[PDB]
Write a protein that binds this DNA or RNA. Structure first.
Ligand SMILES: [Mg+2]
Ligand SMILES: [Mg+2]
Ligand SMILES: [Mg+2]
Ligand SMILES: [Mg+2]
Ligand SMILES: [Mg+2]
Ligand SMILES: [Mg+2]
Ligand SMILES: [Mg+2]
Ligand SMILES: [Mg+2]
Ligand SMILES: [Mg+2]
Ligand SMILES: [Mg+2]
Ligand SMILES: [Mg+2]
Ligand SMILES: [Mg+2]
Ligand SMILES: [Mg+2]
Ligand SMILES: [Mg+2]
Lengths: 139, 143, 63, 86, 190, 139, 62, 97
RNA sequence: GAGGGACAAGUGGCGUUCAGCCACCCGAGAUUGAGCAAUAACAGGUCUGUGAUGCCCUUAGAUGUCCGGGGCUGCACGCGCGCUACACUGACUGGCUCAGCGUGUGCCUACCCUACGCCGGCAGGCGCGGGUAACCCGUUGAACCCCAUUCGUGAUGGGGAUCGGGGAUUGCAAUUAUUCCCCAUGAACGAGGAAUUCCCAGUAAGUGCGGGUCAUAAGCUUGCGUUGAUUAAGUCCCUGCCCU
């Protein structure tokens, strides 16, 4: 009784090992409010404070991250769990509470099922960035 | 209670590690790392006086991760953005004098076993040492 | 920019001039009816034709 | 060489104004009587206000904080935000 | 069965006084989340930046002048400590004088160039409510920087004293100076 | 509780004039001793730098200057000092304050005698290490 | 002077030297659906609220 | 005992696994699958011009080295039978016992 | 890797009968970045890429040739692209934590990265394993950034050229060029004049790494990322281009 569910931020990964249990939160071997930048406090707190209680109690989700950056990890964590709340409610509880808890968070925030993919534009040959150029020399 | 060593707040636990290491006097420092401390290529001496306790504490958790790693590995661990002035900033890796020395002192306290494919790893001696402090500093933090 | 080229409209009129007896109002069946009765060497051109022919179908019933 | 600077943007701030290295007892009575008795206190506030150096300002203000008299709100990297309670 | 709060806050009874800024300051509870930072896909639709809170918009403009273009952690912290100063001052939540600064530093008519196919006449033109919010935020985030440059105060400290003195409509802040010149500019260019 | 200590600007080494700010950076003002040799002379003189420069007594100053003029008695080996292998004496020490003008002109006058252009390009208006000298040091 | 407010009927056309401004027959939320055709800059929609510091220069361009 | 597959055009490579398996799994065998190694790309950038005129535009060449691994533990008189297979020229099938 | 789906496929409306435009629906995605390019020309660059070469010049004291020193690096200057900067959003000491493409020896002809360990302040010196490679270097412990300390608005501790004395590596040898390290000298520089360049979204800028010549050798290049804005989404006013 488990699905290993993926959030997929920009170059980030959060495997949501979802399972019914006693209520646990891990961040790649590390506990709940151990969070590395403090500005992103409330961001990893956004799901549980907006979902509820009886939902949170029954389910163990422990989360392994292979991320690419600090804020990239934190949005991946939320996009993972708010797809893990979609993923765990796919399989056990009926769809009249899955689609309505999905309506909860999407009327809050759309990206929690809509994975909007944005890799960078490639560094163009003529210029130093992905879109820029260099100064011309005129007369 | 059930206390993983990460359940405690991170930086105080590694900075309260520094004070309980003062309680015994666990060090082995020859002449030169007594004399001048510099890092890789950095600006001054360390302001903080307890840098032996500070290098040993940062040595602990990063060796708590990677056993079979080593002196060249903890050279990689610290890191530092060296400045150059007019030329842009490159990277140089860590020291190697303390990066063997800070590992010598904990091996003086029986906290390193060596892989023949690899290098250092923790021992159940030292593994107990961190977690009992993680017993007391989170019991300090919540109280 | 849905401003589809001649060779879409070239085929889509020969679609309607040979095998009308299979086509319908539906897109997602004519997308697969188009494969059985034609030669489409491109997969974007599978969709591009089939969206135009069924868009043409609502005029053929009409005018 | 000749610094024939093509640019022109002058109007500098205040003539390298002096600032007090270590306090006086004129300052100490200025300290102990009203450095609580504002409503909002930053060490940057009291530095320009009473013409006191900021390394001395965080020296003095943490001391009346150390007795617990000053009621702060938090601390972070950049800023240490105080208040007077009661 | 959950209501939305932001921080240490309530996001409630911030009554915007006039219209010509409603629909355009987004501190409704249909546009209130927990945190400033969003995944901004706000270069897609033209007016889709109506659907963004002004608290993020003040952070997003505060990172300017070169050395600070970047570090959204830092510029939220300044607003976090700008919140932490004005709340201490007279009560009267920083969210309220934030709102009433945009209403007071927003140059309700401005200037540009029109035709006759000759020389410049500079007709006095009007300005959309979105450019009101756009131009008021820009003067305040500049208003922190030119105030805080080369003095002992911080970015959070000058910006907090900037926010109060701009919603206190009595000619004391960088924005109100730049706006009340523009009404003098608008009368000359009418 | 540090009431006030009578120390504003003092006399050190008869040529350079030191301030009151911080004890490792007051001694910056001596020619030939800059940032860090002050940091090492101070800390191996066992003086509290957190205690101000404006808080220090008479014997402690000369105790600094004793190791400033002789560090090779106690500690601080040759790679950290100033005189190299050649001073025409095989002598390892540190230069003093007013000694720095003499040791320069002693370098220069023999580099003039040697006909070395390391010395001739200091004599002439030229640059030893300015290996492109179009844009180097104008007017 | 009294200052009055107004919402936008329909968008006529974007003009300027630079094509920066939008010519807005607004309407009167002061009165019936009369208007003045004003030259507003900024992103703007129909039904947008406008602060009219002049109800006089009623400027028409086709 | 294993067989490494490395080639250049992947139409040939999927069919050289298929010519392997169509000739293998009707024998008494225990065969593994085509483990996808990451296709490598040695990139080459060139100035495009022998001299210094004009705009500064770069050619950008890439090879793509496909690689899969298959696995056969067996007697070798079947290996010396599967040795007799006609081959695509850009295919180098090395052997490993 | 085969195969799927984005077509404006439904609704509204504006529309010659149309072509199509515009909002919304569900959908990851309603078009991402490119790459290859039209007929015809410049007397645009390259004869210094060539075993592609025409014609004139040179060939025994050689415009062939190696070898040995020196030059291309000179500086009253002028212009170009850049780099770190001009500070408190910061400077410093430490603690914390997470990348993506790619690179690596006995080759059709001159030839490496590095695990661990010891010695040494630092650059480096020694022995052993592994890599002709998703094995190993490498869960590339990348930096920016973040959590505390000092500094406190000071041409200062912001700034690192010049100059002093040394300590190391490669090399045929580094002088009138190396590279790296250390102390020491602490230089102009107060947000840059009339003018102009680059940019609409993971885009700009801030920040690091890898690749190319490499024995030493990146400020430039070409790719990779990471914190990730501002204002637009319009015109022919400026420069220019397209159709009558
Ligand atoms: Mg930089
Ligand atoms: Mg800049
Ligand atoms: Mg063509
Ligand atoms: Mg020519
Ligand atoms: Mg030839
Ligand atoms: Mg010939
Ligand atoms: Mg030349
Ligand atoms: Mg120039
Ligand atoms: Mg300076
Ligand atoms: Mg420097
Ligand atoms: Mg320009
Ligand atoms: Mg390389
Ligand atoms: Mg390279
Ligand atoms: Mg070059």
């Amino acid at each position: 009784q488990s699905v290993q569910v993926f959030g997929r931020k920009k170059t980030a990964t959060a495997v949501a090992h979802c399972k019914r249990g006693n209520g646990l939160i891990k961040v790649n071997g590390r506990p709940l409010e151990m969070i590395e930048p403090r500005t992103l406090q409330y961001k990893l707190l956004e799901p549980v404070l907006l979902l509820g209680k009886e939902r949170f109690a029954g389910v163990d989700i422990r989360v392994r991250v292979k991320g690419g950056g600090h804020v990239a990890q934190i949005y991946a964590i939320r996009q993972s769990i708010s797809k893990a709340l979609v993923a765990y409610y796919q399989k056990y509880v009926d769809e009249a509470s899955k689609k309505e808890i999905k309506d909860i968070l999407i009327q809050y925030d759309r990206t929690l099922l809509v994975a909007d993919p944005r890799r960078c534009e490639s560094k163009k040959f003529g210029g130093p960035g992905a879109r820029a150029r260099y100064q011309k020399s005129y007369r | 209670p059930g206390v993983t060593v990460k359940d405690v707040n991170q930086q105080e636990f590694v900075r309260a590690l520094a004070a309980f290491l003062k309680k015994s006097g666990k060090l082995k420092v020859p002449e030169w790392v007594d004399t001048v401390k510099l890092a890789k290529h950095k600006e001054l001496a360390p302001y903080d006086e307890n840098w032996f306790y500070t290098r040993a504490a940062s040595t602990a958790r990063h060796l708590y991760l990677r056993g079979g790693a080593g002196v060249g590995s903890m050279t990689k661990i610290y890191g530092g953005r060296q400045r150059n002035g007019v030329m842009p900033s490159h990277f140089s890796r860590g020291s190697k004098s303390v990066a063997r020395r800070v590992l010598q002192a904990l091996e003086g306290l029986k906290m390193v076993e060596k892989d023949q494919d690899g290098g250092r790893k923790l021992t159940p001696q030292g593994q107990r040492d961190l977690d009992r402090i993680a017993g007391q500093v989170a019991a300090a933090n919540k109280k | 920019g849905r401003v589809r080229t001649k060779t879409v409209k070239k085929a889509a009129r020969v679609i309607i001039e040979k095998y009308y007896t299979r086509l319908g109002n539906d897109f997602h069946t004519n997308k697969r009816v188009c494969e059985e009765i034609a030669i489409i060497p491109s997969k974007k051109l599978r969709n591009k034709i089939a969206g135009y022919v069924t868009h043409l179908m609502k005029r053929i019933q009409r005018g | 060489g000749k610094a024939k600077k093509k640019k022109w943007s002058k109007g500098k701030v205040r003539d390298k104004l002096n600032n007090l290295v270590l306090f006086d007892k004129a300052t100490y009575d200025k300290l102990c009587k009203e450095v609580p008795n504002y409503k909002l206190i930053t060490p940057a506030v009291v530095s320009e206000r009473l013409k006191i150096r900021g390394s001395l300002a965080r020296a003095a203000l943490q001391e009346l904080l150390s007795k617990g008299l000053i009621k702060l709100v938090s601390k972070h990297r950049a800023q240490v935000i105080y208040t007077r309670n009661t | 069965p959950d209501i939305k709060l932001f921080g240490k806050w309530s996001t409630d009874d911030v009554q915007i006084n006039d219209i010509s800024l409603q629909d355009y300051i987004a501190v409704k509870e249909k546009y209130a989340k927990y945190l400033p930072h969003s995944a901004g896909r706000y270069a897609a639709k033209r007016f889709r930046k109506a659907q963004c809170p002004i608290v993020e918009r003040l952070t997003n403009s505060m990172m300017m002048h070169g050395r600070n273009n970047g570090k959204k952690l830092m510029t939220v912290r300044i607003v976090k400590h700008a919140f932490e100063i004005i709340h201490l001052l007279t009560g009267e939540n920083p969210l309220q004088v934030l709102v009433n600064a945009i209403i007071n530093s927003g140059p309700r008519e401005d200037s540009t160039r029109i035709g006759r196919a000759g020389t410049v006449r500079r007709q006095a033109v009007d300005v959309s409510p979105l450019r009101r919010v756009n131009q008021a935020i820009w003067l305040l985030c500049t208003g922190a920087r030119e105030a805080a440059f080369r003095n002992i105060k911080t970015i959070a400290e000058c910006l907090a004293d900037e926010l109060i003195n701009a919603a206190k409509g009595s000619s004391n802040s960088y924005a109100i100076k730049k706006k009340d010149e523009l009404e003098r500019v608008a009368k000359s260019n009418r | 509780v540090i009431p006030e200590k009578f120390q504003h600007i003092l006399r050190v080494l008869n040529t350079n004039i030191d301030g009151r700010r911080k004890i490792a950076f007051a001694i910056t003002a001596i020619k030939g001793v800059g940032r860090r040799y002050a940091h090492v002379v101070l800390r191996k003189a066992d003086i509290d730098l957190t205690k101000r420069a404006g808080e220090l007594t008479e014997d402690e100053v000369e105790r600094v200057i004793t190791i400033m003029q002789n560090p090779r008695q106690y500690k601080i080996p040759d790679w950290f000092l100033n005189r190299q292998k050649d001073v025409k004496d095989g002598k390892y020490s540190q230069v003093l304050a007013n000694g720095l003008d003499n040791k320069l002109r002693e370098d220069l006058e023999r580099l003039k005698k040697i006909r070395a252009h390391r010395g001739l390009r200091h004599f002439w208006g030229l640059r030893v290490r300015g290996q492109h000298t179009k844009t180097t040091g104008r007017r | 002077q009294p200052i009055k407010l107004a919402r936008v009927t329909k968008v006529l056309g974007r003009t300027g030297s630079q094509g920066q401004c939008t010519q807005v027959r607004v309407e009167f939320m002061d009165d019936t659906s009369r208007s003045i055709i004003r030259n507003v800059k900024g992103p703007v929609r129909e039904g947008d609220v406008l602060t009219l510091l002049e109800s006089e220069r009623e400027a028409r361009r086709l | 005992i294993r067989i490494t597959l490395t080639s250049r055009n992947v139409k040939s490579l999927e069919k050289v696994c298929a010519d392997l398996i169509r000739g293998a799994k009707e024998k008494n065998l225990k065969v593994k699958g085509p483990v996808r190694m990451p296709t490598k790309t040695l990139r080459i950038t060139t100035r495009k011009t022998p001299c210094g005129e004009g705009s500064k535009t770069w050619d950008r060449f890439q090879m793509r080295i496909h690689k899969r691994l298959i696995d056969l533990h067996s007697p070798s008189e079947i290996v010396k039978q599967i040795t007799s297979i006609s081959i695509e020229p850009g295919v180098e099938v090395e052997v490993t016992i």
